[PDB]
Design a protein around this ligand. Sequence first.
Ligand code: HEC
Ligand code: HEC
Ligand code: HEC
Ligand code: HEC
Ligand SMILES: [Ca+2]
Ligand SMILES: [Ca+2]
Ligand SMILES: [Ca+2]
Ligand SMILES: [Ca+2]
Ligand SMILES: [Zn+2]
Ligand SMILES: [Zn+2]
Ligand SMILES: [Zn+2]
Ligand SMILES: [Zn+2]
Lengths: 106, 106, 106, 106
Amino acid sequence: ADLEDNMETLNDNLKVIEKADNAAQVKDALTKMAAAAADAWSATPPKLEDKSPDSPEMHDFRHGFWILIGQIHAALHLANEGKVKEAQAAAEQLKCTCNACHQKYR
Amino acid sequence: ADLEDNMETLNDNLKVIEKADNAAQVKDALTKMAAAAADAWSATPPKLEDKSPDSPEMHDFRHGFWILIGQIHAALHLANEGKVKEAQAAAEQLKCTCNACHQKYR
Amino acid sequence: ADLEDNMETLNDNLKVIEKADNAAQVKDALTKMAAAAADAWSATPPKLEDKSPDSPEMHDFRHGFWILIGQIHAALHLANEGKVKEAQAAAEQLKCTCNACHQKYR
Amino acid sequence: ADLEDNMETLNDNLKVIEKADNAAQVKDALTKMAAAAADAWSATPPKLEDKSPDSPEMHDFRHGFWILIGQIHAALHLANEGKVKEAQAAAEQLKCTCNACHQKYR
Ligand code: HEC
Ligand code: HEC
Ligand code: HEC
Ligand code: HEC
Ligand SMILES: [Ca+2]
Ligand SMILES: [Ca+2]
Ligand SMILES: [Ca+2]
Ligand SMILES: [Ca+2]
Ligand SMILES: [Zn+2]
Ligand SMILES: [Zn+2]
Ligand SMILES: [Zn+2]
Ligand SMILES: [Zn+2]
């Protein structure tokens, strides 16, 4: 899909997890975030369309999604062990990424 | 879906990656493998039907999918940087995780 | 060093982190655990000395340390951001690994 | 140690890995690179002396070492399975992380 669409999914499902109650809501939100993150991974942001597909900036932008995807799956690891509260905490801690990448490329 | 269905999707797209020609081909297979692996993550294999869901055996079973998905996303990292031959070798290498879990639980 | 020595380091520093107060104690304990885990990674446990260096069992044993090392560094990630309490939680959650691997190879 | 000292250790052992012949050689270099990277993790680069330690810029700076150490341990995974040529190619590939952080903060 489209990069701003992916970011909406990321942000909505982030708030679903905060308000979630059971383990199925959390696990399904995290699944949607993973899918969106993997979709964004191949997009070119506005402020980088001038640079080369193989530039260090583009590499760095993609690395931001690699990191986020790992964190989302580390949260899925916890939720699939039944530790729903610890998975919600991990989803909160994810924030350091959405903000590091925004500061540079949003 | 079924654990067996997930395993069929993993096996099929592994073969696709070994025969692919273009990066978009390798990229779509890895993406399907990641989803199948995430869905398999929650399953109980027959050999463990009797164990408690919080036993170490189920913990260890789920860890296999966590390591597998991490390897799939590392291959996706190479694919999305354009390095298709490297992604294909990455897909080849992750058969150590397939074989390790099969020896234990298949 | 020696595998039982590494396990002592792992277990001691695990309890240092629980009792820790500031961010330097936690970060230094986690550093020692990482070093021990990386040292154990190349050892052969008692109950596996019969099998081949390249057997799926040996692969699986090493994968256990790869996983643990990642978790320790995910905890270092948090401690280096100043989130000492969240790093202590992550060190607690590490437990699913020490127990999954013990159940199989200890 | 100094950030500059850590960078020198990283650079030196990268060269060692490209010229190595035996697995023990590749394994010791990666191990030294992992320690240098963990020690660099806490440093402040000159370009960021003015930013707050909890700014997104420092978060992003520290994330670079987290991704780098993950890549180093993935190469160590191959090395400890005996696949030295694969570990050497893994070391080669992680220069994307070197170049990405240098473009931003060196
Ligand atoms: C545990 C963590 C596993 C990992 C990692 C992989 N597989 Fe697997 N696989 C697993 C089980 C328990 C089973 C048996 C399920 C059952 O109900 O019997 C399987 C089975 C397969 C099969 C057989 C499928 C069939 O139609 O009968 C295949 C072809 C297969 N697995 C492939 C496969 C690949 C390619 C993997 C890595 C990419 C892999 N599996 C990992 C458990 C686990
Ligand atoms: C940030 C996350 C970095 C990563 C990843 C890597 N490096 Fe780096 N490096 C970084 C900085 C801020 C600096 C400058 C430090 C300063 O005080 O000026 C450097 C510098 C180097 C150097 C120069 C060393 C010197 O003696 O002047 C080298 C040779 C170097 N870096 C190598 C290197 C390699 C091989 C890396 C990946 C394996 C790598 N760096 C990653 C910040 C970051
Ligand atoms: C790069 C590595 C990013 C990461 C990680 C995250 N986001 Fe982001 N996001 C990024 C860009 C380049 C943009 C702008 C794209 C554009 O077309 O302008 C965004 C945008 C958003 C927005 C605003 C979207 C809007 O229509 O206003 C939000 C609310 C947002 N992103 C949320 C978000 C969250 C919660 C993240 C962490 C889970 C996250 N993003 C990560 C680049 C990157
Ligand atoms: C394999 C992947 C392991 C992981 C992960 C952890 N441990 Fe372990 N441990 C392992 C083995 C094969 C052994 C026995 C080795 C032997 O020579 O007999 C151990 C041993 C221990 C012990 C007891 C040591 C003793 O002298 O009695 C403890 C207390 C211990 N290990 C702790 C520990 C912790 C806290 C771990 C997680 C952080 C952990 N181990 C992981 C194999 C593996
Ligand atoms: Ca069948
Ligand atoms: Ca079948
Ligand atoms: Ca100097
Ligand atoms: Ca110098
Ligand atoms: Zn962070
Ligand atoms: Zn392996
Ligand atoms: Zn676990
Ligand atoms: Zn890269």
